[PDB]
């Protein structure tokens, strides 16, 4: 039942969940009662089980359910028993770029946004590797400012990652990949919502920069260090005896 609920709640990755666990139960039951249905490794035995249980209740969905040789076999058997940017004009899918975005373990909402961007504005293109590259980079720089604000060892590792995920030794093209999308995507309300959420504004806060730029000297350029820093740095030399 644990494994049943596991594989059944593996579909997302009201009446649905209930009726589907009941379905898989009595389905597996019917399939194992008689002596007719054998040599079926339990390795895989809760999948077109789940697909036909989708087919049964009320509404069914061909996509995102089967997601192979024996998949067809067992189906019939049960059903009877009952570089990257020089490349010109490439093509992509939903899950291709879900992969290239989920490699950073970023959320799926940002990915859906880049997907919407694409399927509306993937029309007039030369190469979508550039656009989606720049997109997910300017997702990373905006959401990952904290860890980077304290760890400048990150910005080399990250750019190195996407330099070789798309197979180049030259990188200034990637720099352009970022600034051009930033020129493009600059002013949409959803981009706006993300900037108020994760608070980069060029990577710097609002309540600081406005005094940086309106015309002030109270502007806190933190050359000096904060108090808790020293409060914890002192422990390193406390035990200096050893």
């Amino acid at each position: 039942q644990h494994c049943v609920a596991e594989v059944l709640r593996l579909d997302p990755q009201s009446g649905y969940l209930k009726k589907l666990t009941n379905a898989t139960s009595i389905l597996y039951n019917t399939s194992l009662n008689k002596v007719m249905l054998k040599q079926d490794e339990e390795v895989a035995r809760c999948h077109i089980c789940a697909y036909i249980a989708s087919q049964k209740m009320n509404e069914k969905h061909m996509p995102d359910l089967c997601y192979p040789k024996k998949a067809k076999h067992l189906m019939n058997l049960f059903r009877q028993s009952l570089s990257l940017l020089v490349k010109k004009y490439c093509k992509m899918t939903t899950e291709e770029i879900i992969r290239l975005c989920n490699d950073f373990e970023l959320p799926r909402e940002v990915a859906y946004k880049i997907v919407d961007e694409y399927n509306i504005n993937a029309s007039r293109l030369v190469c979508p590797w550039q656009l989606v590259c720049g997109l997910v980079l300017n997702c990373t720089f905006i959401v990952f400012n904290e860890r980077r604000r304290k760890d400048p060892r990150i910005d080399h590792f990250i750019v190195s990652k996407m330099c070789s995920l798309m197979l180049t030794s030259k990188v200034d093209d990637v720099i352009e990949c970022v600034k051009l999308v930033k020129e493009l995507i600059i002013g949409e309300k959803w981009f706006r919502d993300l900037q108020i959420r994760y608070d980069d504004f060029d990577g710097i806060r609002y309540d600081e920069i406005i005094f940086r730029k309106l015309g002030s000297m109270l502007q806190t350029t933190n050359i000096l260090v904060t108090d808790d820093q020293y409060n914890i740095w002192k422990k390193r030399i406390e035990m200096d005896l050893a």
Binding site: L224, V225, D227, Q229, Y230, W233, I237, D240, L241
Partner: protein, 68 residues
């Protein structure tokens, strides 16, 4: 004469002063002069303050006698 404690606190977060500190941590396994001077006794601190405050900043006089 008016060298207050809060001033003494904030000047401690001179990060270059931390560079100097740790440079001497690794120059000397013992830790006697640093406890002699540091904020754990602020007397030596303010003493060092005036001591390194008085200096010439010889860069500027260097530019001067260079012009000369």
């Amino acid at each position: 004469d008016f060298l207050n404690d809060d001033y003494l606190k904030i000047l401690s977060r001179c990060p270059t002063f931390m560079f100097f500190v740790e440079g001497l941590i690794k120059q000397h396994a013992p830790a006697d002069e640093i406890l002699s001077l540091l904020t754990n006794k602020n007397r030596g601190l303010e003493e060092f303050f005036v001591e390194f405050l008085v200096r010439e900043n010889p860069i500027n006089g260097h530019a001067k006698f260079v012009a000369r």
